[PDB]
Amino acid sequence: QADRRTRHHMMVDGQINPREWFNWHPKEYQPWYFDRHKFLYEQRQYAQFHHLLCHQVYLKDMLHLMRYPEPYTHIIDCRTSTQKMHRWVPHSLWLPRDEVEYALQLSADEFLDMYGFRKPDKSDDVILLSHNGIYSEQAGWEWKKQFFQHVYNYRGGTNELFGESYSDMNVSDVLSPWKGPFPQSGVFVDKWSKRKVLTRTGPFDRQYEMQDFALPDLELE
Amino acid sequence: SYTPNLTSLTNQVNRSERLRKWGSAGVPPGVPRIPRLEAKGIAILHESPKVILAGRSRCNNFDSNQYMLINKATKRCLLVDASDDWPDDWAAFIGASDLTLTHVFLTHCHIDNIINLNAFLTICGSRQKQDEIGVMWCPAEECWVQNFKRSCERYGRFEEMHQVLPMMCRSLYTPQHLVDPVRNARHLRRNDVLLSAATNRATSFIDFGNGVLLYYIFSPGHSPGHMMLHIPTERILFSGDLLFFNKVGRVDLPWATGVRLAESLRLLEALPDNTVVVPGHGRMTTLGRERRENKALQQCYQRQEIGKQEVSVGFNEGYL
Amino acid sequence: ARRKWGQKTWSPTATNGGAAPANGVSAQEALQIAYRPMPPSQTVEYEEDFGHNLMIHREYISKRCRDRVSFELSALSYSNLELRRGQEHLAGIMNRERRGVSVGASGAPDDQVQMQTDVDANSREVLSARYLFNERRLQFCDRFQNFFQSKLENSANGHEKQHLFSLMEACAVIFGCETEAARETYYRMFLGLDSETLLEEDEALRNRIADAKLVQRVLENNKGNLPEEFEEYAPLYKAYITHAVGKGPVASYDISTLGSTGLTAERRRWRTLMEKIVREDYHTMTEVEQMDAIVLNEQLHTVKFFDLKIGDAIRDILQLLQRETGVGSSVNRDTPVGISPNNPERRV
Amino acid sequence: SRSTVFGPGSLYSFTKFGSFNRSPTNCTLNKRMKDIFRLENQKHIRNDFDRERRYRMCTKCGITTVTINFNNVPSARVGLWGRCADDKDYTHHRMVDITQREYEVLRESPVEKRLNWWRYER
Amino acid sequence: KVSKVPTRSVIPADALRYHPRYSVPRKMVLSNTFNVVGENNRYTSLKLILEKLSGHVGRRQYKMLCNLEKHYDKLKDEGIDWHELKWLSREELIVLFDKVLHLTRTERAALLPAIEAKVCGVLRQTDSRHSTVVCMNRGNANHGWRCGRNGHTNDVYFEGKAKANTAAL
Amino acid sequence: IAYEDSFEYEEYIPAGGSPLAHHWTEMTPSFSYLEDEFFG
Amino acid sequence: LPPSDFPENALLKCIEKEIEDEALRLDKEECPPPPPTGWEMYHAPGTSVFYGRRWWLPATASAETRATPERHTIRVQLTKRDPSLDPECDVRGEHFPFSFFVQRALGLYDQSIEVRADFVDGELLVDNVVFHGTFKTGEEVRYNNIFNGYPGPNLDEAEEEVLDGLQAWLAERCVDDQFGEFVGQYSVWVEQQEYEMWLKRLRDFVAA
Ligand SMILES: [Zn+2]
Ligand SMILES: [Zn+2]
Ligand SMILES: [Zn+2]
Ligand SMILES: [Zn+2]
């Protein structure tokens, strides 16, 4: 807390030296729409995985499968922390997220030995849950990595079913303000390009765009 | 300008800048060719017992100038910064003067200097058909040779895009082509010299003939390799883009450093004041008038006197 | 001595071409520039004698840098694994440089081909993704098509079709070349069929065959029942045998060597077919060559669309972020929001 | 620019400028010109004895190399301009160690004599 | 002859400033809204000073934590100006800060350097028509805390425009 | 030694002032304490 | 210097080079610069402070019976500068600060009038007049603080009768522009003699 100054060496250009060395150029980056309100994997940095997003099953589908279950629509819990689970979703099986990339590599007999329930067939419907729908989304990506044709995700599984207020506790790794990053300590590039990459135009909380080239606008004046 | 990647296309500030600069069009209008109207003739600037300087001002819409040195004895001419929208007056001038074009000097390889270079070489070699013309240039401008197409993209020079530059062809400094045993117009150019950045007053010259020596000076800041011509017997300094009338060259282009431009202005203080400096753009001046009345040199020497270790001078709006 | 700011001590000239003579430098002058006084505690010197001539190599890497300098700038290899990999990493960087100049700029005018590309901003369809040929290559292209239209119009995907188009287009680029050094770079761009990589695959094949005879020698001498093409299994069998008897801590699980005997036989059959069309010897083809021509035509058709599909994927993201925000609008929906479309209790 | 960040053609790519000649097509020189440009005949290493020397021989192109102070500076860039048997890279050498005495008797011989000495002698 | 470049021994640091043409920049005259000092024109100098005291500061862009822009509306609702804020005594500032403004002890600490120096709230002319430049010179009591330089004489609200005309406002 | 007979006037190095740190003569690495072990 | 035993051969050979060319140069003087008359120059070999000292007798009118002798003392501290801020910060200007004590007739900071002057660009710039000890006003005012004593106002802001009376008091004491030139000359010789001792003492430390 208390507004720690950060140990990065970014700086705005002064009022004395000319603007030079335009084979790198920082400018302010402003996109069209806000993405911070959206789901975490519906944001801007995950757009390329947009076709990898699992189809959504909703609350009413989950209540209908609670009341009237199907033999091959497998409800699977993807929550990892055993200290944060307090209730049982009906007709659910426990396959925690951090083991999924190993779990689908097993045979059916090894799946039965290492989890106590049968391995789902690749044509069976699989429905995944988590606290917010984040561990279930990564698990759905791991389930779609293998050739599983029908994989669905209930976004906000436990927190809407049981009414809890929990989270999957995703870190989203951001450097500590004592950790000095790469381009300050290094002779990987020449001194002009090193000074021109480390400069920015404005405060260092917003996003910027780095230009690899620039030509002078001779047609203005 | 630059390559349109994913970040440049999803940026709203890019569309805001392209609306602010160019209005509702959004695309920059290029730098077009000067038409046959509003074009002036070639002027003979200087006549001397040794050489003759013949030039033409505002030969581009970059507002550059085209100069040629003529040796009175050997009948050999030399173009410097070959960029004229009509290199048909120059070939007719050379043919009606009974001159031989042997080399073309290039200060730096920006688009305001090498836009019509293949046209110069092709038309002058075609007139020589009724030994080819060599090119004298600095290899650091290699980094500006490869972006000749991109600069032809942004300034609307589409007919000069798909043209292999003669500085890119195989010279004597390069490995040779291993052709099938069963051509030499483009495979090898024996007349090509590469200037060295170690320029001195002893041996860094070109023997123009009749005892006239042209000392090339390595002076970066506007370009990584920028070569002035100095003729001390004629008091003539072809500066190129380093120094102009009451202004200096730009630094707001790539591979341009302000402290290199300051060192390039500082390596010019040993010439006399009656040396006529001849710039690539605009009107010509003298070095004494630039020592007295140019504010960029005043700022450079004032920053040097007050104690700046890295003096950085340079223009951000001017000539390319 | 110690210098002062603004005060310089003038020194006389040597009067030998200045500091760097532009006219030239003799052998005895350049001998002193060769064996320049580097500090020998941090300097490596190396010379190789190759018959007539010899080449000197001296590198000095300073002491105030080795904690901050990049591993690529100061290529220090403190192990034999770093020696073999650091040389092979610097192998391809140098080899792409000395090969890439033969077809781009500083190449022969018959060795430079360009592609024209145009992608529609709305429909995202590639229009005119052609090559820019000359008049000599287009005569080869219509010599290809007039022969194959005369063979495939009587029997048998429509009338206006180009038979084996991505095979002859890859062979027309190689045909119009005049330098063999620029010919092998196009063979590398077309699925890596150059003689540099094919002799690399032939070296690893003969190394696996020589290892297959060694495992065959061990298993016969120990016992005194095998797979068919044992040279593919022999890197995996020998990695266990050295692990079993005690000399080696790792056995191998890499199955990339399996199928390589039939794979490298197909690559040299692909290369021999590519040379057969350049010399215009396509007027008779064996049935083994006709199966290879159909396979290689579809393999060469998808390698020229690698960059165009990269830009196609970025154009997907461009039209994605321009979509209407929210879950959608009720005007443009076939399904209610809070349920699946396949729900039995759909219409309340 | 961003196209020249990762090699080939990067900033610190020291092989983008050019290659060596590696050919007998020019400068036919004698044995004295080889002796004056020996590494071992220079003054600064003639009185240097604590750095380690390694004498190796290629069995493919037949070159003789000597490397000094490689244990302190093991640069992988050393010998990158080697250009083995037929315009091949210096990853194709397969060097074998030779002693100091048999380096001197093999340094004067041409490459075919070195390869014949390796294959049919010793 | 080699002419020396004319320099100076003692030069002010304002002359070290950069211009892209190495020349004197254009000083465009302010818009027609500033011709008469009115209630719409009075508090534009107070708004920009509170805007700069809350924004980012320095080459490292240090964000000011205390937002002094929230007190701009209650300052102009009372009818007090930035030039009228400098005329208030010490006892009139404790009444203004505690009762009306409810300025906290850290928000009072970020505003007090602007009141200690008696900054002249005169909009300087600039190269654009919309000017965000306030003269940061210290004011004197003889010239109405307007610093008395460049024509800021005791009623000048904007550079290039008329006086205050206190009989109207 | 006058200025016109100097090594700095052989190149275009000026007579007095700040040293041209990006000139090729100032970028040239000098080791004069090892000069007697190489060129002697 | 064998490289197996001594890994610091890049520094020990460079410092042996720097011993000789600092002695083989002919621009240096072996003798100290000659001080003006009366002044005796002390300097400890390890420190960077050198002291000047002379006795003096003022001009005393005939109404007074006796002229008391004075004690003039010069204290010069060598100027320090930080090279870590270069080439970012500007070149720091060379100036020679010194102290001038005046004691009537036993240390430096008891009953002494201390005046600080700066020799910059060929002229003296008198900055402050610091008092130490109990002095007479008009009562007794004691300045017993030696580190944070009241140094007086700067003379740019001081009153005009204070200025012209002080310069008449300073020109009578033979402290002027020619005296400050010697302090600029003696401190250059002192720093040069300390630098060759610094190079000698560094070679004993690194080689050990
Ligand atoms: Zn230019
Ligand atoms: Zn120009
Ligand atoms: Zn070899
Ligand atoms: Zn003001």
- What DSSP element (H or E) covers C18? none
E16/B313 Cα distance (integer angstroms): 11
H-helix or E-strand spanning residue C253: none
Q: Does residue D44 have a known ligand-binding role? A: no
SS3 at position D75: strand
Give dist(CA A76, CA A78) in Å, integer: 6
Report yes or no: D40 and D65 within 8 Å, Cβ to Cβ.
Answer: no
| Distance in angstroms (rounded) separating the CA atoms of residues B150 and B169 | 19
Q: Coil, helix or strand for D109?
A: coil
CB nearest F22 (choices: B199, B259, B270): B259
Evaluate whether D66 touches D77 at the Cβ level (below 8 Å). Answer: no
Q: Which two tokens stand for residue C14?
A: 């040597």
C-alpha closest to that of B170 among C111, D3, C189: C111
Smallest Cα–Cα separation from G58: which of G39, G47, G72? G72
- At E108 the three-state DSSP class reads helix
Which chains are within 8 Å of B by 3+ CB pairs? A, C, D, E, F, G
- Pair B151, C152: CB distance under 8 Å: no
Nearest to E82 by CA among E136, E27, E28, E161: E136
Distance CA C199, CA C133 (A): 30
How many angstroms separate the alpha carbon of residue B80 from the centre of ligand 2? 12
Residue A196 exposed, middle or buried by CB count within 10 Å (0-12, 13-18, 19+) = buried
| DSSP type of residue G84 | G
- Please choose, from the candidates B274, B265, B263, the residue with its C-alpha nearest in 3D space to the C-alpha of residue B295: B265
Rounded Cα gap, residues B79 and B101, in angstroms: 8
Cβ within 8 Å of residue G64, ≥6 positions away: none
Task: Determine the 3-state secondary structure of B129 from DSSP.
Answer: helix
Distance from CA of A23 to the nearest CA of D (A): 6
What number of residues does chain A have? 221
| One-letter identity of residue A38 | K
Cis geometry, peptide bond prior to residue D8 (ω within 30 degrees of 0)? yes
Identity of the residue numbered B285 = T
To one decimal, the resolution in angstroms is 3.1
Task: Select the residue of F7, F37, F38 nearest C13 (Cβ to Cβ).
Answer: F7
CA-nearest residue of chain E to B297?
Answer: E5
* Residue D77 contacts residue C93 (beta carbons within 8 Å): no
- The tokens describing C242, both together, are 């050295």
Angstrom distance (rounded) from CA C306 to CA A18:
42
Phi-psi region of C18 (alpha: psi -120 to 50; beta: other; left: phi over 0): left
Q: How far apart are CA B299 and CA A18, in angstroms?
A: 12
Sort A154 into a burial class: Cβ within 10 Å, 0-12 / 13-18 / 19+.
Answer: buried
CA dist., res. A156 & res. A40, Å (int): 12
Helical pair C234-245 and C195-223, crossing angle rounded to 10 deg: 50
Task: Among A17, A20, A25, A219, pick the best mutation site for testing chain B contact (most B Cβ within 10 A).
Answer: A20
3-class DSSP state of D41: coil
Q: Cite the beta strand spans of B180-242 per DSSP E.
A: 192-194, 205-209, 212-218, 227-231, 236-240
Q: Which residues of G touch B312 (CB under 8 A)?
A: none
Token pair for D11: 């900033």
Is the link from the previous residue into G87 a cis peptide, with omega within 30 of 0? yes
Find tokens 């401008």 and name the residue.
B141
| Residue C261 φ then ψ, to 5° | -70, -45
User: Burial, A182: exposed, middle or buried (Cβ in 10 Å; 0-12, 13-18, 19+)?
Assistant: exposed
Burial of A140 (0-12, 13-18, 19+ CB in 10 A): buried
Record the tokens describing residue D106, joined without a space: 């093999």
Specify whether the backbone of C76 is left (phi greater than 0), alpha (psi in -120 to 50) or beta.
beta
User: Which residues in chain A precede a discontinuity of more than 2.5 Å between C and N?
Assistant: none
Instruction: Give me the long-range contacts of B44-49 (CB less than 8 A, separation at least 24).
Output: B46/B234, B46/B236, B48/B72, B48/B234
Q: CB burial class (10 A; 0-12, 13-18, 19+) of residue B263? A: buried
Handedness of CA G147, G150, G152, G154 (dihedral sign): positive
* Distance from the E26 Cα atom to the nearest Cα atom in chain B, whole angstroms: 15
Instruction: Find out whether B308 and C5 touch, Cβ atoms under 8 Å.
Output: no
| 3-state DSSP of A78-131 | CCCCCCCCCCCCCCEEECCHHHHHHHCCCCHHHHHHHHCCCCCCCCCEEEEECC
- Report the alpha-carbon distance of residue A137 to residue A139 in Å, rounded: 5
Contact call for residues G50 and G41 (beta carbons, < 8 A):
yes
Cα(E36) to centroid of ligand 4, in Å? 19
Q: Binding site annotation covers D93?
A: yes
What residues form DSSP beta bridges with B184?
A: none
Instruction: Name chain B contacts of F9, Cβ cutoff 8 Å.
Output: 201, 270
Q: Which candidate from E17, E60, E65 shows the least CB-CB separation from A16?
A: E17
| Break sites following residues in chain C (C–N > 2.5 A) | 156, 224
**Could you tell me the two tokens for B28?**
């920059």
Structure-token pair, residue B27: 């695309």
Residue C248 has phi, psi (to 5 degrees) of 135, 130
Task: Please state, in angstroms and rounded to a whole number, the distance separating the CA atoms of residues E48 and A109.
Answer: 73
* Residues C76 and D74: beta-carbon distance below 8 Å: yes
Burial (CB count within 10 angstroms: exposed 0-12, middle 13-18, buried 19+), residue C298: exposed
Inter-CA distances, C76 with A148, C47, C82, Å? 47, 18, 8
Q: Measured between alpha carbons, how far is B104 from B167 in angstroms, rounded to an integer?
A: 11
- Report how many Cβ contacts below 8 Å link chain B to chain C: 56
Q: Which residue has the tokens 């730096």?
A: B108
Element containing residue C50 per DSSP (H, E): strand C43-50
C-alpha distances out from residue G91 to A41, A160, B296, E6, G73, Å: 55, 68, 21, 21, 31
Q: Which residues contact B220 (CB under 8 A, 6 or more apart)?
A: B140, B226, B257, B260, B261, B263, B264
What single DSSP character describes residue E35? S
Q: Report residue B153 as tokens.
A: 């993209």
**Proportion of chain B in helix, strand, coil states, percent, rounded to 5:** 25, 20, 50
Q: Nearest Cβ partner of C47 from D39, D61, D72? A: D39
Residue C36 burial by Cβ neighbours in a 10 Å radius (0-12, 13-18, 19+) = middle
Residues 6+ apart with CB under 8 A from B182: none
Select from A33, A49, A56 the least CA-distant residue to C324: A33
| Chains contacting D (3 or more CB pairs within 8 Å) | A, B, C, F, G
CA separation for the pair B222, A20 (Å, rounded): 10
Structure-solving method: cryo-EM
Q: Which residues of G touch C39 (CB under 8 A)?
A: 9-10
CB contact at 8 A, G88 and G105: no
The answer to the question of whether D27 is labelled as a binding residue is no
Chain D contacts in chain B segment 59-118 (CB below 8 A): none
Q: Does residue G73 contact residue G52 with C-beta atoms inside 8 Å?
A: yes
In F, minimum Cα distance to D42 occurs at F38
Q: Identify any residues that bridge with A73 across adjacent strands, giving them in sequence order.
A: A125
One DSSP character per residue, B27-96 reads: SPP--PPP-STT-PPPEEEEE-SSEEEEEES--STT-B-EEEEEETTT-EEEEES---S-TTHHHHHHHH
Q: What is the C-alpha to C-alpha distance for residues C294 and C166, in angstroms, rounded to an integer?
A: 10
Q: How many CB atoms sit inside 10 A of residue G56's CB? A: 13
Tokens at C326, concatenated: 């929210």
Chains B and A touch (3+ CB pairs under 8 A): yes
Q: Which residues have their alpha-adjacent CB atom under 5 A from ion ligand 2? A: B 112, 241, 280
Please spell the DSSP secondary structure of G98-143, one letter per residue: EEEEEEE---SSSSEEEEEEEE-SSSEEEEEEEEEEEEE---EEEE
* Beta-bridge partners for G139: none
Say how many Å lie between the first and final Cα of chain D, rounded. 56
CA C323 to CA A33: how far, in whole Å?
10
Helices C165-175 and C260-278: angle between axes, nearest 10 degrees: 60
CA distance D1 to D10: 10
Distance between CA G94 and CA G98 in Å, rounded?
A: 13
Distance CA E3, CA B291 (A): 6
One-letter amino acid at E38 equals: G
Q: Tell me, rounded to whole angstroms, the distance of Cα E145 from its chain centroid.
A: 11
Residue G97 CB neighbour total at 10 angstroms: 18
* Strand partners of residue B206: B214
Q: Are the C-beta atoms of B133 and B98 separated by less than 8 Å?
A: no
E168 contacts: CB under 8 Å, gap ≥ 6: E37
Distance between CA G99 and CA G128 in Å, rounded? 10
| Beta bridge partners of residue G74, listed in sequence order | G52, G100
CB atoms within 10 A of CB E114: 20
Distance, CA of C113 to CA of B221 (rounded, Å): 36
Chain G CB within 8 Å of residue F34 CB: yes
Residue F39, both tokens: 């060129």
Residue C202 tokens read as 């032939």
Q: Are B104 and B82 in contact (CB under 8 A)?
A: yes
Tell me the C-alpha distance between D29 and D41, whole Å.
18
d(CA D48, CA A207): 57
> In this structure, which amino acid lies at residue B16?
S
- The verdict on a CB contact (< 8 Å) between C179 and B177 is yes
D61 is in an annotated binding site: yes
DSSP one-letter string for chain A: ---PPP----B---SSSPP--TTSEEEE---SS--TTS-GGGSSTTGGGGGGPPEEP-HHHHHHHHHS--TTEEEEE----TTS--S--TTEEE--GGGHHHHTTS-HHHHHHHHSSPPPPTTSEEEEE-SSSSHHHHHHHHHHHTT-S-EEE-SSHHHHHS--------------TT---TTTS--SS-HHHHHHHSB-SS-TTS-EEEES-----TTT-
- CA D71 to chain G, closest CA, distance in angstroms equals 14
Contact assessment for residue B69 and residue B78, using Cβ atoms and an 8 Å cutoff: yes
User: Are residues A45 and A215 in contact, defined by beta-carbon separation less than 8 angstroms?
Assistant: no
Say which DSSP state E15 is in. G
State the distance from the centre of ligand 4 to the C-alpha of B24, rounded, in angstroms. 40
Q: What are phi and psi of A189, to 5 degrees?
A: -140, 165
Residues of B in contact with D1 (CB under 8 A): 254
CA distance C275 to chain B (A): 16
For C175, the token pair is 């045909």
